[PDB]
Symmetry: D2
Subunit: 219 residues, 4 copies
């Protein structure tokens, strides 16, 4: 029978691109997010979601690109916690309730981001979330073995994550990046998708965080 994928966050950006690349005659690709009725921050919603999916092979979580920007002294802690509730706690909830459905040879692939390790002013919420994701990924890899668990850590990537910026501001952001990254380009969703596919396919990889950040971490 077909290999079955669940992509929480697969309705937009990196997750949607991955889901697109995963579709074939030999696969079933489920995507879900708030717009499909799933709130990954909500434990009951996640629990009942997997109940309806049943046994599957690979879980990928890309949900939750929002975080309040700003200095620690200025950021509203309520908004920071909200951000944590989706990206961090949502991944925890997805693993907690999804793992029991994973078939032999399956895996979980979470998402962090280079701010876990690139120290940048005004980014503590993103950095803390990503650091937590990477640590939890490794604990999960140990606890769920032989189910494999890894994380992809993207650098700046052109997606809907930035649909709320003024378009000119967005372009200037992309251009600054292009101009200062060693690779001399901004990431495309398909560049990041490739890394999830690699984690999914490699039966000798678990507890790993794969950076795809155009050299951003090199400072």
């Amino acid at each position: 029978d077909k290999t079955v994928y669940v992509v929480l966050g697969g309705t937009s950006g990196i997750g949607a691109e991955l889901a697109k690349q995963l579709e074939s005659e030999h696969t079933i690709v489920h995507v879900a997010s708030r717009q499909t009725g799933l709130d990954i921050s909500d434990e009951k919603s996640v629990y009942h979601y997997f109940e309806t999916i049943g046994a599957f092979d690979h879980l990928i979580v890309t949900a939750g690109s929002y975080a309040p920007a700003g200095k620690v002294v200025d950021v509203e802690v309520t908004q920071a916690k909200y951000a944590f509730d989706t990206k961090f706690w949502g991944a925890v909830l997805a693993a907690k309730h999804g793992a029991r459905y994973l078939k032999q040879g399956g895996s979980i692939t979470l998402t962090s981001g280079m701010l876990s390790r690139k120290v940048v002013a005004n980014t503590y919420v993103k950095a803390a979330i990503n650091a937590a994701i990477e640590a939890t990924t490794k604990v999960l890899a140990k606890e769920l073995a032989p189910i494999r668990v890894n994380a992809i850590s993207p650098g700046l990537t052109k997606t809907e994550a930035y649909k709320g910026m003024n378009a000119d501001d967005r372009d200037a952001m992309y251009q600054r990046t292009q101009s200062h990254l060693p690779v001399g380009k901004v990431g495309e969703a398909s560049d990041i998708a490739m890394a999830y596919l690699f984690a999914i396919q490699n039966s000798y990889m678990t507890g790993t965080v794969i950076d795809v950040d155009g050299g951003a971490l090199l400072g």
Copy 2:
């Protein structure tokens, strides 16, 4: 003009030992926690606390030793969020409202723990919290400069943190650790206190995480 310290969590274990060591004729040492009326997880309570203290030199946070032990698939997420609310968000709140009172030459020293980087089954809450603390320590060091910000990362230390274990259990934990660690002993509070004093004293250290873990990280 005495040097003024604030130790949030200074009423027990590691904080208490440090507070004791900071006491002198040329210092004033404030300690606080729930038993003195400070709930570090409550923003208005933290704000009130620093209003009562006024200008001071060094802030140290050791508060929040609790975390629900167990596998990701077994741990109660409400309890996990509770732990985060004290140790992680408490540290965030303490920096956020304490920073403006720090005098020239001042510092903030937070507390993580070797589980940020030592991967151990059944410890995701502690590991995630400590990873978040370490990432946030570094962002703070960048944002609050020239105020210095560092973190102490302890290994197993004999304190009231374990007061709620089956006494048979705790002794077994202590003996097994003493048996397996390169240094052949469990940590004493004074060993860890020494590290805060070092962070406080060193005008050339910021953004650093100091491990005092008896070699546990070496596996």
Copy 3:
């Protein structure tokens, strides 16, 4: 028109498997090592090797699986230095003289190994070599941009690397690993080759070290 690859160490184990996977109607794959007349430890030999190849697209270095095992206090430093001359200095020399031949879109992929970061008694030579490779990889990524530079860090993989072992001891080594790694198998060369293909393919990745170690780093 065709994409040209150079694999130094491509005559055995991981390098040979990679070279086999790179072969196609669209590519030209060159492999080299001592048995083909290239000693990667010898600067003149390396310099003259690249003259004979001319312009190419991707350099991969897997050469040098040997290192004297044993405690720091016991290991013959002369033999330790010999191991460095091939695997570490070899990589340096290949980058130093090969870089100027790399076409637009090109990349260098080096090889380290999990012992860079998994602390194991009796392995200081392998650990130090791998640590040096990973650091040099990142410096190279910055210096050679937009040429991309990454490293693959393998865990235990069944190859000719262990041809010097008694066959029974080797089977037992493999089995102890299979029995204890989270993924419950020993690495095959094709599992590691997959990672080099990924690094070659991803135009948004540079300065990255990719672990494919079956979970060994999780301890």
Copy 4:
């Protein structure tokens, strides 16, 4: 029965400052370098040296500040290997022959430097050396237990290490760093020496790398 220190590299800069601070009525401090007849890169010289000293308590190695600056593609590999021979292999040799003379409760403290982990163009030799030192430090901590083994990782410090610079360019270097660093100053030898004293003093620390870099790693 006084406590005996050996500081290889103790005739200049950081090592000399530490030697000065170690002097006491209850200590004996030995310093040594080429100018005293110890060439730490030469195994028989190192062996001879420890025969002359006999049983002692704490070994500190600061020897070998030199390295050829420049890009991988430009640096003379002979000079690069010379740098490794002193700072890296010298530390290896010192531990190898010094370890057997270490009294109960003793320790080894080595020196790396922030470039192990801060990626900077034109620094591969220093970066690789320091990465190798940090990895070897941890292996030694495991192998020599209960002897404790740690390393200090300095950032820019005002010492004789920069004597060979055009006194104009050296001032440019100091001033530029003072203005870029979070702590707003260049390191003084005493700042770094403090960290060795802390490693020597702490019976619960081993396998640890202590950064004292004024925030350089924060980027």
